[PDB]
Amino acid sequence: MQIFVKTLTGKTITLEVEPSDTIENVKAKIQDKEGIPPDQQRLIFAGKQLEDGRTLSDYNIQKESTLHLVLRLRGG
Amino acid sequence: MQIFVKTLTGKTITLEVEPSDTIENVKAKIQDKEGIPPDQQRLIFAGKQLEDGRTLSDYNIQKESTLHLVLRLRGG
């Protein structure tokens, strides 16, 4: 299925995912598509910071849901 | 698995480790990779000075955890 990911510049990308994808899977797909290291990605859905071991379905992410991607440097 | 090690200059390295590695193993790997004598290394995780005979798992060090490396000369 397709989901959308929205950045702070307004840009929106489409990703191919399954409900069983974990957040780490999604970050890996953003790496593949956009070249962003997973450690520089912060994903948000429904006002929650998304955790690497939980699935899209755990957060109620569905076909055509929109996540937010914020880039950060590693805190250290 | 991979862990990160952060220095006081801000530099971060990646190391290949196992949960069963001891701290002495980790210092040996920093020697191999970066040429720092073990006696010049101080490792910190979770606000604890790490001791050469304990394992990564003993300190709750996990995949993608970040340790801190401080260089010191030998006290004597």
Side-chain angles (χ1 to χ4, degrees), chain A:
Chain A
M1 74 189 189
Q2 295 85 59
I3 64 174
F4 301 101
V5 183
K6 172 69 157 302
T7 83
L8 290 170
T9 71
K11 179 170 179 181
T12 301
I13 63 179
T14 312
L15 292 181
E16 184 63 29
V17 297
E18 298 298 329
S20 53
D21 278 20
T22 64
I23 301 309
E24 193 54 52
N25 293 146
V26 176
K27 288 173 175 167
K29 293 171 180 184
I30 294 174
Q31 159 111 30
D32 302 327
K33 181 180 189 300
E34 305 289 343
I36 314 303
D39 274 270
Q40 288 176 348
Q41 303 180 36
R42 306 289 187 274
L43 287 170
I44 298 166
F45 183 71
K48 289 181 170 174
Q49 299 183 305
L50 306 187
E51 200 275 343
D52 289 334
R54 295 305 93 197
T55 65
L56 296 181
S57 56
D58 284 331
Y59 296 111
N60 198 42
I61 292 164
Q62 300 172 273
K63 187 49 165 295
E64 286 98 21
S65 289
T66 299
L67 284 53
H68 284 77
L69 171 64
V70 177
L71 303 190
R72 298 295 299 189
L73 306 188
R74 283 179 52 94

Side-chain angles (χ1 to χ4, degrees), chain A residues 24 39 52 74-76, chain B residues 4 6 10 12 64 66:
Chain A
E24 193 54 52
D39 274 270
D52 289 334
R74 283 179 52 94
Chain B
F4 301 101
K6 172 69 157 302
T12 301
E64 286 98 21
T66 299

